[PDB]
């Protein structure tokens, strides 16, 4: 089963992602194929999949940027029916905005079927052009047709997955306690994490005894990433991943506060020094507390 | 013994505080008597007392706003010698900036003796006027003279005192853990705490599921009070008191994030709801974690 989370949905035949054109929130904004840059935020190409209770393998797909939903125009079963962004809600009964998403016959890519029409999301003619039509189209669950096959590239972690990444780190103190704040987190590329730090004003901040020391830098960086999340995205029901840690040195006679993020593969954490924007696999402290 | 901390130093005879005139950081800025408003920040009238190691009951007195030190001009023992703000450091050997501070003969007020001159801080003629001269003057430890007696009104708590205030609160969960970040905290009047909240932009922020929910409001308010501390004061070696708490309801099936501050008497905590600027003695949750 596809898990709740944020996905970059990439065609199996050509390197085009599912893109809400210009990120527009207007009802009837086309959803098109468009090229993408790996290890960036692809602003118009992130989709929050919300599972519908009591309907197997069926979701709403909310564009993270617009807050509008993938919508099969008037729910038509005609091949070539427009797929657009449309206002909706996460747990709608509107079958225009309900999608059954199950593994294709290759067992790695998915097919996306409209719950009402039973037609499939189709990159028409496998066109790799920027702005290529995506439509509802006749098809079957089992056929090889790459026009209708989609890799769901997972961009988010659960709190359970973030907890597992911390737990397998070699720099955790015996007394460690973690405090989880949210459920599902967008994982930032370091390039984006760095840009939020640069735009925070922290690079210019000076260390001062107690009044602006490590704990002030680490909390300011978490607040900046929280503010950036709310200001950047119109969808709800996720958070941005940015942790605060307190740590103690080997000798047990000095402590430090810092941030952490996750690797590309979501398996491990990486420490971030908000006083100089450095990423470290070893920051010289073992964490005794985190909140994220 | 006077404890390390921040003090509002009020004459025992007339309601004048020790004031660094216009808060100026210029060397030789007069220190004068000036009237004050209780339950405000008296911006030019707060003094950080730093104990000198291996010298009994002897301190530097650093103006919180200017970051400059109470200085007996050229260390003269002549009655009427100027007391000014002057650049220095927290642990100086300059006897112009070293003050022996011990209880007067009334056992409640203090006298302030220059370590070098052995003359006392004196509100000349007990003048209650705004801008009245304060000078080094002949005197004795035991005499009743109110010109040379000073109430040290304590404006800060230690981390130990903040921990005690939390521990005697009736809304702490059995599983509570606290994480202390700094050593000595300026306690804000609610009027100032509220002003920092109003100027943060949080009053305009909307609740949004995960992406800007209670934990985002509480962390944003702590970051705002941290930023205000660094931006407002030039002294180092203290922090501003503002806590974050996570709490769980009676039924154990809902949790919430919020802030807390301290009462005027420094004995108890008060909860602060950063989503509406309310102060509460009961916020409907029992704290299972705090950092402050």
């Amino acid at each position: 089963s596809l898990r709740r989370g944020i996905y970059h949905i990439e065609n199996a035949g050509v390197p085009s992602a599912i893109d809400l054109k210009d990120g527009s929130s207007s009802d009837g904004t086309p959803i098109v194929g468009w090229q993408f840059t790996p290890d960036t935020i692809n602003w118009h190409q992130l989709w929050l999949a919300e599972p519908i209770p009591n309907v197997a393998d069926t979701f709403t797909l909310c564009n993270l940027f617009s807050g509008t939903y993938m919508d099969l125009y008037n729910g038509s079963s005609e091949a070539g029916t427009a797929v657009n962004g449309w206002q909706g809600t996460a747990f709608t009964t509107n079958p225009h905005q309900l999608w059954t998403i199950k593994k294709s016959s290759d067992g790695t890519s998915y097919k996306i079927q409209n719950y009402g029409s039973k037609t499939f999301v189709d990159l028409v003619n496998g066109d790799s052009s920027d702005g290529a039509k995506i439509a509802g189209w006749t098809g079957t669950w089992d056929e090889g047709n790459p026009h209708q096959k989609w890799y769901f590239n997972r961009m988010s972690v659960s709190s359970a997955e973030a907890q597992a990444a911390i737990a397998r780190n070699p720099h955790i103190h015996g007394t460690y306690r973690g405090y989880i704040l949210d459920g599902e987190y967008l994982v930032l590329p370091n390039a984006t994490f760095t840009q939020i730090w640069k735009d925070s004003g922290l690079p210019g901040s000076k260390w001062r005894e107690q009044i602006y020391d490590a704990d002030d830098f680490a909390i300011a960086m978490k607040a900046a990433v929280g503010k950036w999340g709310a200001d950047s995205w119109k969808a709800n029901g996720f958070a941005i991943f940015c942790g605060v840690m307190l740590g103690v040195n080997k000798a047990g006679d000095a402590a430090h506060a810092y941030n952490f993020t996750l690797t590309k593969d979501h398996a491990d954490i990486v420490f971030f020094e908000p006083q100089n924007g450095g990423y470290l696999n070893d920051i010289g402290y073992d964490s005794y507390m985190a909140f994220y | 013994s006077l404890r390390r901390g921040i003090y509002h130093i009020e004459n025992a005879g007339v309601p004048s505080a020790i004031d660094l005139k216009d808060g100026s950081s210029s060397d030789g800025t007069p220190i004068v008597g000036w009237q004050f408003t209780p339950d405000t920040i008296n911006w030019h009238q707060l003094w950080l007392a730093e104990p000198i190691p291996n010298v009994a009951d002897t301190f530097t007195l650093c103006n919180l706003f200017s970051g400059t030190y109470m200085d007996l001009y050229n260390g003269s023992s002549e009655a009427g010698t100027a007391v000014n703000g002057w650049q220095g450091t927290a642990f100086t050997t300059n006897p112009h900036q070293l003050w022996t501070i011990k209880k007067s003969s009334d056992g409640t007020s203090y006298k302030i003796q220059n370590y070098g001159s052995k003359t006392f801080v004196d509100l000349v003629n007990g003048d209650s006027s705004d801008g009245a001269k304060i000078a080094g003057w002949t005197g004795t430890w035991d005499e009743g003279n109110p010109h040379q007696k000073w109430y040290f009104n304590r404006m800060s708590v230690s981390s130990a005192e903040a921990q005690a205030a939390i521990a005697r609160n009736p809304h702490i969960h059995g599983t509570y853990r606290g994480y202390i970040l700094d050593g000595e905290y300026l306690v804000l009047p609610n009027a100032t705490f509220t002003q920092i909240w109003k100027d943060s932009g949080l009053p305009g922020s909307k609740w949004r599921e995960q992406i800007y929910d209670a934990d985002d409001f509480a962390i944003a308010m702590k970051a705002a009070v941290g930023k205000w501390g660094a931006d407002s004061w030039k002294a180092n070696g203290f922090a501003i008191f503002c806590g974050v708490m996570l709490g769980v309801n009676k039924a154990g099936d809902a949790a919430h994030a919020y802030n807390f501050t301290l009462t005027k008497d420094h004995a108890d905590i008060v909860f602060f709801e950063p989503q509406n600027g309310g102060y509460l003695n009961d916020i409907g949750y029992d704290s299972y974690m705090a950092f402050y």
Binding site: A214, L246, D253, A255, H256 | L181
Partner: peptide
């Protein structure tokens, strides 16, 4: 100790 205390974080710095």
């Amino acid at each position: 100790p205390v974080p710095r």
